Design an enzyme around this catalytic site. Structure first.
Site: not given
Ligand SMILES: CC(=O)NC[C@H]1C[C@H](n2cc(-c3cccc(OCc4ccccc4)c3)c3c(N)ncnc32)C1
Ligand SMILES: [Ca+2]
Length: 450
Positions: A132, A137, A153
């Site tokens: 993802d 991020n 993450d």
């Protein structure tokens, strides 16, 4: 499992809402070390793998170390939550820093992607896939222009099920690799996502775009894109070659993260005209994404407020012995603790000490009906001011209004059906093809039952 999170850490401030759960700035009760804790609720998130596979990846992640990867210090688990404790970074999201500066060139884009690829290459060697990867991020280690990027993450995707709520899926469809959508994927999906981020850095427009989530996923699945926008004329041929190799459909043919570092574009531009058109489109893109997110969170907070307003009134009505509508400060705490005992532990209120303090803050301002309004108005206040700030930021020409075409793009990114918002607009507005902040807020209120 054995060790308790609240006994070691105390919540200081809410940093934000990330993927899978809320992010809290916490502090160690002994050493005073600050840390960013992602709190994943077990009810709102399902486990894809078993408990032993999750603990094995956690253990590996705690021993990994790279300057472009967010460090995971600890991991805790209680009856209903998972707590991922890591380092704090105050530089904000990468794209928020790029929209503030006036000059942005291929040297800056190459320096950004070299860092993202260094982190990815290192994590791929340790068999960890992100899956993802997106601009959200990519955080900057400090509040500066020459600060390191830290990817967050890295490794969650594999053990936690993705959310089905649009407030959490916003902006994910642009970066997902086609093979992730059909089920068979490996570490090459992170090269595709980085390729999409590189395409947006040098042009400010996503390679696979559409008026809604499904239209974007259709474009990604087909995998066709072009360098046919005017702004690509001022970009080099080696930058386009790296994007072609990163956005190759068949993953076995797609370049690896390791080989992407040895590419001529990375080797030449890290060892030069300003892309002004690309900055303007990243500004527009970031503002559009942030207003769509703020609109969805505003509606969610209004529904959460309605649920908690009636639930807290029912708890206080049963606690009212005589029936005068009043209660003591000690009673209100028992009722507020009952709201968390029935409707889950709050992300801000980590333990009983944070609940007692949260009640004292409302009791200082404020009949339990008046207290109910203040405690709920404080939770809505954090969401309404973000909406106005996002509306003001989207309104770059300070006209005070947003056009019908801009609403279609906003509601398109928010995934609100075209015929539903047009009908809601006519009920509140009733026909200049533009709305002010109050009219925009009134549309969102009507789009969530109010
Ligand atoms: C928004 N945001 C999210 C984080 C953050 C907080 C806790 C965990 C996290 O990622 C979880 C992770 C990290 C490394 C490996 C596996 C999972 C990300 C975070 C942070 N550290 N500092 C400033 N803003 C942050
Ligand atoms: Ca305007």
């Amino acid at each position: 499992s054995t060790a308790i999170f609240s006994d070691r850490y105390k919540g200081q401030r809410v940093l934000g809402k990330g993927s899978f759960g809320e992010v809290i700035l916490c502090k160690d009760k002994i050493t005073g070390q600050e840390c960013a804790v992602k709190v994943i609720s077990k009810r709102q998130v399902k486990q894809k793998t078993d408990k032993e596979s999750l603990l094995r990846e956690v253990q590996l992640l705690k021993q990994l170390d790279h300057p472009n990867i967010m460090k995971l210090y600890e991991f805790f688990e209680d009856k209903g939550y998972f707590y991922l404790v890591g380092e704090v970074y105050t530089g904000g999201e990468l794209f928020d820093e790029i929209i503030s500066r006036k000059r942005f060139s291929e040297v800056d884009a190459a320096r950004i992607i070299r860092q993202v690829l260094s982190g990815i290459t290192y994590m791929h060697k340790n068999k960890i896939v992100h899956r993802d990867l997106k601009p959200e991020n990519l955080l900057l280690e400090s509040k500066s222009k020459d600060a390191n990027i830290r990817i967050i993450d890295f490794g969650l995707s594999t053990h936690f099920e993705a959310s089905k709520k649009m407030k959490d899926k916003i902006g994910t469809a642009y970066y997902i690799a086609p093979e992730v959508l059909h089920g068979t994927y490996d570490e090459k999906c992170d090269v595709w996502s980085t390729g999409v981020i590189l395409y947006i850095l040098l042009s400010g427009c996503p390679p696979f775009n559409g008026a809604n989530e499904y239209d974007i996923l259709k474009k990604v699945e087909k995998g066709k894109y072009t360098f046919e926008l005017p702004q690509w004329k001022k970009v080099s041929e080696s930058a386009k070659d790296l994007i072609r190799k990163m956005l190759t459909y068949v993953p076995s043919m797609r370049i690896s993260a390791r080989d992407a570092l040895d590419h001529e574009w990375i080797q030449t531009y890290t060892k030069v005209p300003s892309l002004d058109n690309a900055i303007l489109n990243i500004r527009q893109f970031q503002g559009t994404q942030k207003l769509a997110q703020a609109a969805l969170l505003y509606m969610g907070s209004k529904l959460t407020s309605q649920d908690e307003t009636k639930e807290l009134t029912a708890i206080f009505h049963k606690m009212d012995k005589n029936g005068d509508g009043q209660l003591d400060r000690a009673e209100l705490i028992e009722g507020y603790k009952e709201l968390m005992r029935m409707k889950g532990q709050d992300a801000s209120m980590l333990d009983a000490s944070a609940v007692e303090h949260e009640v004292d803050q409302v009791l200082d301002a404020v009949e339990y009906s008046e207290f109910v309004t203040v405690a709920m108005d404080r939770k809505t206040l954090l969401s309404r001011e973000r909406l106005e700030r996002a509306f003001r930021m989207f309104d770059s020409d300070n006209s005070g209004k947003i056009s019908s075409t801009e609403l279609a793009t906003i509601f398109g990114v928010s995934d609100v059906d075209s015929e539903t918002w047009k009908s809601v607009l006519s009920e509140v507005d009733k026909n200049d093809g533009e709305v002010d902040f109050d009219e925009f807020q009134q549309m969102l209120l009507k789009l969530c039952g109010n």
